[PDB]
C-alpha cells in the first residue's frame, strides 16, 4: 500500500548503477538520466499510451502547462498554482491495462517543487477512483517504473480509465510542485 | 562467450554494462565520460583493487608505459610497440573474486589504436589459464563493465586486430574491482 523510495526495488528505479550512479548529480547527470531513462523505456515491448488519455491539472502557472510533463524534455515542467493538495487527473476513452507507470523525481533538480508523498488513485471516473498506493518520495533523482506487481490477481497489471494523483505535501516547504515527465504503458 | 559491445543498441538488459549509457562526441565530452565513468564505478560497492597487482604488457612505447592505462587521466594511455597480438598479463599475489573489470573504449578518441577484438584468459597462472570470453568492439565510446564474479589469480587479454587497419592498441584506462 506504500512505497517508500530512496535509490541509496531495484527494477523500480530506471536508472542507476549496479543504485545511485552520481552521489551528487549535476545539471548534466540529471538530463542525462532524464533522457536515458525514456529510451530504456521506449525500448521495452509494451506500448505508449501516455498521450491518449486526458490530463487535468488542479491548477497550473501560465507557461508550465500540464502537456510539460508529458513531453520528451528534462527542462520543462508543469508547475502547479494552488493551495495544496495540487491534483493530476488522467481520463482515457475506455479501459486499460496499465503494466507501467514511470515518473521522474529529482530532488536535486526540483527543489522545494519535489513532492514528498503522492497518492495514486485508479478506476473507472473520479467518483469512482479507489486509492492504490502511496509513494513516499523521499530521495530520489531519476526515472522510477511502477510495474503494479502487486494484485497478482489481475496479474501485474492496473486495468483502469482513470487515474489520479495527488501531491499533497513537497520537500523544503514547497507550496507548488514541478513535473518534468511521467509516461503510461500498455502491454504488447 | 562472445560479448557484442556496441553502445547504440539500447537494452534494459544491457544497461550496466555501458556505464556511460547507450548513445562525434568532442574531446571535451570524451573526457567527462571517462571522469564520470570512475566517479560512478567507484561510488559503487566495489573494491578497486587495481593497484594491488602486477601489470605486464607484451610491449610499451617509451613515455606511454602501462602505468597509463591505471593512471585515472583521460588523456594518457598505454600504447602497444610491436607485432600483433598485443598483450596484457594482470597478476595477483593472491587468488582474487573480481566482481568487475572495468575497460575504456572510445573508438573515437582512439581511431586506429582502438581495439575491435579483445580476448580474455584467467587462471592461476599462465600455464593454466583459460578463455572466458570474446569482446567485440563494434562500437563504443566509454567505460565498459564486464561482470564475467571470477575468482582468478592472473588475468590475459590479447588485442588480434585494431579498427581502421590499426598496428598498435591504447588503453587509458581499466581498472579491478572486488566485491565489498
Ligand atoms: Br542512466
Ligand atoms: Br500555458
Ligand atoms: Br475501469
Ligand atoms: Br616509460
Ligand atoms: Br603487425
Ligand atoms: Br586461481
Request: charged content about 20%; aromatic content about 12%.
Amino acid at each position: 500500500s506504500v512505497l517508500v523510495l530512496d535509490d541509496r526495488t531495484k527494477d523500480l528505479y530506471v536508472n542507476g548503477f549496479q543504485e545511485i550512479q552520481y552521489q551528487n548529480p549535476t545539471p548534466e547527470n540529471l538530463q542525462h538520466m532524464f533522457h536515458q531513462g525514456i529510451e530504456i523505456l521506449d525500448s521495452a515491448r509494451m506500448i505508449n499510451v501516455t498521450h491518449l488519455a486526458l490530463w487535468k491539472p488542479s491548477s497550473f502557472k501560465l507557461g508550465n502547462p500540464v502537456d510539460f510533463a508529458l513531453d520528451d524534455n528534462y527542462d520543462t515542467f508543469w508547475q502547479s498554482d494552488g493551495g495544496q493538495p495540487h491534483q493530476l487527473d488522467i481520463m482515457f476513452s475506455k479501459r486499460m491495462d496499465i503494466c507501467v507507470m514511470a515518473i521522474f523525481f529529482s530532488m536535486i533538480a526540483d527543489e522545494s517543487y519535489a513532492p514528498s508523498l503522492v497518492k495514486v488513485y485508479a478506476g473507472h471516473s473520479p467518483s469512482d477512483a479507489r486509492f492504490y498506493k502511496m509513494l513516499e518520495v523521499r530521495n530520489v533523482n531519476g526515472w522510477v517504473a511502477l510495474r503494479f506487481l502487486d494484485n497478482r490477481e489481475d496479474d501485474q497489471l492496473l486495468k483502469c480509465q482513470f487515474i489520479r494523483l495527488l501531491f499533497p505535501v513537497n520537500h523544503e516547504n514547497g507550496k507548488d510542485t514541478h513535473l518534468r515527465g511521467i509516461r503510461l504503458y500498455v502491454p504488447s
